[PDB]
Amino acid sequence: VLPVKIQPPLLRPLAYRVLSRKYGLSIKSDGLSALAEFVGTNIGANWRQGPATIKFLEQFAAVWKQQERGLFIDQSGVKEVIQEMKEREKPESSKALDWRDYFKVINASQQQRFSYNPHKMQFIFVGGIAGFLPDIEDKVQMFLTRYYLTNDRVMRNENFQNSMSITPIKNLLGRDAQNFLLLGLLNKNFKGNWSLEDPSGSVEIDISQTIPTQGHYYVPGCMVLVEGIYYSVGNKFHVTSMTLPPGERREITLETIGNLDKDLKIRLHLLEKELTDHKFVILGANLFLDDLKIMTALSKILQKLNDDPPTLLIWQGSFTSVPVFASMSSRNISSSTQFKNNFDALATLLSRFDNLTENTTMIFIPGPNDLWGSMVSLGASGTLPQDPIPSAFTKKINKVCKNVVWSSNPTRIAYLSQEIVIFRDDLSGRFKRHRLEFPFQKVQETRKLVKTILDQGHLSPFLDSLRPISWDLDHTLTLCPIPSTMVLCDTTSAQFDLTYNGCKVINPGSFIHNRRARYMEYVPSSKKTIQEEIYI
Amino acid sequence: MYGDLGNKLVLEAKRTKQLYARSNQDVNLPMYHEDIIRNILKEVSNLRKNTEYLKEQQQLGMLDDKVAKCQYFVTLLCMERNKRCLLAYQRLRTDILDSMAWNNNGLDLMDTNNLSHQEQEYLKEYCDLITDLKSGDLVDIDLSGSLVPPSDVFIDVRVLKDAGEIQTEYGVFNLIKDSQFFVRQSDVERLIQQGYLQKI
Amino acid sequence: SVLAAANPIYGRYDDLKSPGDNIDFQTTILSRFDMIFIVKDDHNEERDISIANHVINIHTGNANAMQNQQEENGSEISIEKMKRYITYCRLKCAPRLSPQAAEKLSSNFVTIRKQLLINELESTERSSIPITIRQLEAIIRITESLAKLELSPIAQERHVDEAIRLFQASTMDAASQDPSLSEIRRFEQELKRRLPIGWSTSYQTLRREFALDKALYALEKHETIQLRHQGQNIYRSGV
Amino acid sequence: IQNDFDLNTSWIMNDSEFPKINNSGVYDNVVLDVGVDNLTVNTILTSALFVHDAFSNDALNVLRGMLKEWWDEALKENSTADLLVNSLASWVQNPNAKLFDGLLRYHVHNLTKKALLQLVNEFSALGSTIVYADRNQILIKTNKYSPENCYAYSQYMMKAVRTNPMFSYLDLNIKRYWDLLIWMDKFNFSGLACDYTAVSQWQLKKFLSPIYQPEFEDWMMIIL
């Protein structure tokens, strides 16, 4: 532990003999100098650093898997990883592991570009001011990828559970009256009649004499599994039975992807078991900063939670009563200035509670009444991959606290090996309005909605003509891994919490139901939830 | 009959064998033919179900030893042949992966999409095993070193890919592109293997 | 192999006349031919400028420099090396189709025959361009050639897709050429008087009002109507 | 249904491109700069003279009657009436309006576009070609070469325009008379205005180096 400085020329023979000779590692002058400095700092007389260099090279070969380790980041990375492995074994560090290094939140622009190779692969893809703009091919494939993922789910689940297969639409032409089962995106043609779209082609369907599954919501834009008899005389598929593709468990996707490491998995499991007491507090929907009664209720809730600040405090969409827009007036209506003053008032009313907002991360989710997402949509269902709240309105709010995150509306969290998806949207109203009837209580409706959402494998299985989506940022909405915890914030749906297919779904509902500031609480270690209704 | 899937698989295996046999192109393995594997696995499962069916039907029914023995024996031989075809294909892939690992341990650690998860884990652990063997007792010699005799000690080389400056055992090498060294062949073997120096 | 260069009657194609009038070749000879490209002089001024620049570079000694440089770059290769490569590929590989490729080709052939049938029904006249089993054989041969140039022992659906694209670009392009009129005029006038000049309406409204309705496509050519919402909304463009 | 995305609704939200007529050249003919006003008011008044993109024609007739009574109250002594018609002109495109409708605004915009097209056709038939038209002013190239023979011709032209029923409520006034005019766009032009005054509004001069901007200006007056 004696600090000292050792020069690169003397360590060069031994360093070479170890890294290059022993395992084939290229060493540069800068990396050699930095490693000599590190060795001198963590050992004196520079004799028994051979184990240290061996640990460095073995970790580098096991994780990095390249050459030329002397780049100041391979060296630093391996050094730090050695630090955490020494820490978990309980040198340079002998402390304990912290969940902050294993807790993170992912925005729509920070996800991993997972494009599924149609034959068999789920590849990874990962430049200027206008560098984020999606390309035309992305608009082409935003539904190609959804089709391919749902097809993988079908050919992994249905055939092994139920084994007559899927016939491509293109291959339905010459067959006269045979029985067929199609996995196709239900839609209405430009002619105004119902049909199914598929990469092989599209087929118009005789929706009459069809019996669907009653535990699902069916809308234009969701992909279904129809079955029936084709007719070449009218070139129409007389469908008799239809259902949504069956869902799959999260571990079923994890074993396919094969993405975790073993030591990382053990550390995450150890932290999950040890961190038994961690509280997540979810606020309701429509936290209107303009409504004075809402600030009264929010002050009461903030005081109550200042007694025991939770681990996380998520803030949901539509922070103001009126949708924002370019407001023309000579007064302070000026919805930008009004929204900034609303955040300033929130900061003033929120800085009053020092125990709160400390040792607690608060995340803000945009909604239908938020800047840069509502200023053009005018309170309508605009772009689904909503960008984070602009920092131009968050000067005072962020200045008050130390851990404030403004995240995407369909954001992802990697707090542990589990993934938590936050999503604020009134999906129930859209589903009820757009549900097509069939010529052939509340908990049942919520079950149908959740089953549709999970079986479709998409956050919004809707046509882009019904809800626009950023073409490149579509994997952010796909439920490919089926992560366990769904923060399905909604305002037109009753508050509930249900589990299915190894996935947990919570709808805290609107912040104010009748007279109470409803908010929600969750314990990940027990994976147990509880409502919190507080009277005004 | 029943071995057609295995026959096609072993034909593809020999095709890959001639593919890698030509020169030393060091091509990656052809993509794992999970399709044929799953097809022959389904065939084997159906034949096993047929064996169980014949056994139970002989137990409940009155079947002489002749047909019950003969059909069961034929199906067992069918599994023997199909398993042998699968074993030959997997053994070929394993040995070619061993070749890649042995030659490229000092060269590079790489498109893995052509390999199944079992094969990928096998390669990952086999590199560890090779390193363990190199560092166990025979560490003085380099077990992954060149298999050509060291005919000459001092050779001249030209830098293909500029790598800036790299510290050698005693001095340092300034790998300026389009520059020629004349140094010992001993301490530049790994760099030539990686593809930085070209001349002999 | 047969590579024939012909000229439609009247010098120009004269698309105003019927496609059978512009081609004196009978259906029998047209049946043997696999690909039938019909090139047309677009007279596109930017395309004209590009071609003029290329030709000027060709004449003023710039071709002998740029072609040599581009060939040395590796994106172009000399005549002799292409000759030897073609010989080696033709003498080395004879690819055959996969069953999935066969299903895709059968489906595409049925689609193409249905398209030809509906086109002939609309025109009330046999199309001068014949599409038959020999055309499916041509597509199979092109798929085999695509697999062969890659030396792939078996043809993949990538080759099938590319062959279908080329077939649609040449043979369907020939077969899609077009020269009652009373119904077209009535529809044009009724939508001009009904659909406002600056407004739009859904295509299902026109369907309910009331065919192939080639009148809407002709008016789109005239740039008086425009289909924007994926064909579900026709808007009077301002004419 | 107003809270979900609709292609037609979204398109009519961001559909504000107003066509502009602009002709670049030098015109020795006397050209008049007539400024229009109350174009929206006259358009909604004269609008009397299946389609999913069309606004409710019943509400359109209700608004037309409302505007008629406002107008003929404005003809008599009523400041509230004319203030209200100005506010309705400024109000249709207001999202803050407690009765705002995007379809109504799109319909009004299209009607104004077609009214301007009718006015341009009327001026062209009158015998004065148009070199600028931007819903706020019109530049008419009268064939009268003589600057003296402009006032009577201008009065006759404006009387003929006023005789048009669809433009009776439209009000116009000549801003400047150009015996000579060099015109490209709204912000790049010059010339002689009333025959004695001269103007030079050249934004492109700002794009030249300071050494050559005065040379640009000086040679421009020389060529003028």
CB contacts of C206 in chain D (<8 Å) are none
The amino acid sitting at C153 is P
Residue C114's alpha-carbon distances to A173, A182, D13, D192, D224, in angstroms, are: 9, 22, 42, 70, 70
Contact D3 A426 (CB under 8 A): yes
Which two structure tokens, joined as six digits, stand for A432?
A: 């009820």
Angle of CA points A491, A494, A496, to nearest 5°? 115
Distance in angstroms (rounded) separating the CA atoms of residues B53 and B56:
5
The residues with which D180 forms a beta bridge, in sequence order, are D192
**Cβ contact (<8 Å) for B190 and A24?**
yes
- Residue of D185, D170, D33 whose CA lies nearest to D112: D170
Spatial distance between the Cα atoms of A402 and A179, rounded to a whole number of angstroms? 63
D170-D175-D176 Cα angle (round to 5): 140
User: At residue A220, what is the residue type?
Assistant: P
Amino acid at D186: K
Amino acid in the structure at residue C141: R
Distances D220 to C220, D207, D212, D216 between C-alpha atoms, Å: 46, 15, 12, 6
Which long-range CB contacts under 8 A does A476-481 form with residues at least 24 apart? Answer: A476/A108, A476/A111, A476/A385, A476/A408, A476/A410, A476/A412, A477/A384, A477/A385, A477/A410, A478/A145, A478/A146, A478/A149, A479/A421, A479/A453, A479/A454, A480/A114, A480/A149, A480/A253, A481/A250, A481/A253, A481/A254, A481/A257, A481/A419
Contact at CB, C231 and A170, closer than 8 angstroms: no
Which member of A15, A23, A28 has the closest CB to residue B166? A28
Query: CA-CA distance, C109 to D136, in Å (whole number)?
Result: 60
Whether chains B and D touch (3+ CB pairs under 8 A) is answered by no
Q: Strand runs (DSSP E) across chain D, as ranges?
A: 21-22, 25-27, 31-37, 128-133, 137-142, 171-178, 180-183, 188-193, 197-202
How far, in Å, CA of A503 to CA of A486, rounded?
7
Q: CA D96, CA D109: separation in Å to the nearest integer?
A: 18
Asked whether D8 and D21 are in contact (CB, 8 A), the reply is: no
CA–CA separation, A388 vs A371, rounded Å?
9
Note whether A17 contacts B169, CB cutoff 8 Å: yes
**Cα radius of gyration rounded to whole Å, chain C:** 23
| Residues of A in Cβ contact (< 8 Å) with D91 | none
Count of CB atoms within 10 A of residue C24's CB?
Answer: 10
- In chain D, breaks (C-N over 2.5 A) are found after 49, 194
Per-position DSSP letters for A119-130, written without gaps between them: TTEEEE----TT
At A120, list the tokens: 């068999």
Cβ of D5 within 8 Å of Cβ of A466? The answer is yes
Name every chain B residue with its beta carbon within 8 A of the beta carbon of A20.
169, 190
What span, in angstroms and rounded, lies between the C-alpha atoms of A398 and A395?
6
Opening angle at CA A30, ends A25 and A36, nearest 5? 80
Name residue, tokens 């009218």: A234
φ and ψ at residue C218, rounded to 5 degrees = -65, -40
- Residues A227, A198 contacting (CB under 8 angstroms): no
Q: How far apart are CA D189 and CA D220, in angstroms?
A: 11
Q: Is the dihedral of CA B153, B158, B162, B165 positive or negative?
A: positive
Pairing of strands A503-507, D180-183: unpaired
Instruction: Give the chain D residue nearest C202 (alpha carbons).
Output: D52
Q: Are D160 and D42 in contact (CB under 8 A)?
A: no
* Amino acid (1-letter code) at residue A172: L
Residue A437 tokens read as 């009837």
Instruction: Choose the mutation target among C190, C194, C201 for the interface with D, i.e. most D CBs under 10 Å.
Output: C201
Neighbours of chain B (3+ CB pairs under 8 A): A
Task: State how far the Cα of A497 lies from the Cα of B187, in Å rounded to an integer.
Answer: 66
**How far apart (Å, rounded) are the C-alpha atoms in residues A462 and A469?**
10
Hey, how many other C-beta atoms are within 10 angstroms of the C-beta on D48? Answer: 12
Residue of chain A nearest D91, judged by CA positions: A328
Confirm if B71 and B54 have CB atoms less than 8 A apart. Answer: yes
Residue with tokens 């491509």: A168
Q: A363 phi and psi, to 5 degrees?
A: -115, 135
Closest CA to C33 of C125, C179, C157, C134: C134
The span from the CA of D57 to the CA of C175, in Å, is 47
Please state the domain extents for chain B: 1-146, 147-200
**How many C-alpha atoms does A464 have within 13 Å on its Cβ side?**
14
Could you give the CA distance from residue B161 to residue B179 in angstroms, rounded to a whole number? 10
Mutate to test the interface with C, among A170, A185, A198, A465 (most CBs of C within 10 A): A170
Q: Which two tokens stand for residue C112?
A: 């193409």
- Taking Cα atoms as reference points, which of D22, D30, D36 lies closest to residue D130? D22
Report which secondary-structure segment, H or E, holds A131. none
Q: Whole-angstrom Cα distance, residue D105 to residue A226?
A: 43
Of A168, A192, A201, which has the smallest distance from its Cβ to C204's Cβ? Answer: A192
The Cα–Cα gap between C60 and A120 comes to 52
Contact B167 A13 (CB under 8 A): no
The DSSP code for A152 is H
Is the CB of residue A174 less than 8 Å away from at least one CB of chain C?
yes
Tokens 């000049």 belong to C197
Question: In this structure, which amino acid lies at residue C134?
Answer: R
Strands (E), A125-249: 179-188, 194-198, 201-206, 211-212, 223-231, 236-243
Residue D4 is encoded by which pair of tokens?
A: 């979900």
* Exposure b/e, A52-80, CB count within 10 A at least 16 = b: bbebbbbbbbbebeebebbeeebbebbbe
Contacting residues for A260 by C-beta, under 8 A, at least 6 apart: none
b/e burial code for range C155-189 (CB count within 10 A of at least 16 → b): bbbebbeebbebbeebbbbbbebeeeeeebeebbe
According to DSSP, the β-strands at A361-364 and A404-406 are parallel
Please report, for chain A, the start and end positions of each structural domain, with discontinuous segments joined by +: 103-158+245-535, 164-244
Whether the Cβ atoms of residue C129 and residue C174 lie closer than 8 Å to each other: yes
Identify the contact set of chain D against chain A, taking CB-CB distances under 8 A. 1-5, 7, 13-14, 94-96
Q: Are strands A201-206 and A236-243 parallel, antiparallel or unpaired?
A: parallel
C-alpha B30/C-alpha B92 separation (Å) is 12
Backbone angles phi, psi at C10, to 5 degrees: 80, 15
* DSSP H or E stretch at residue A208: none
Q: How far apart are CA A208 and CA A204, in angstroms?
A: 12
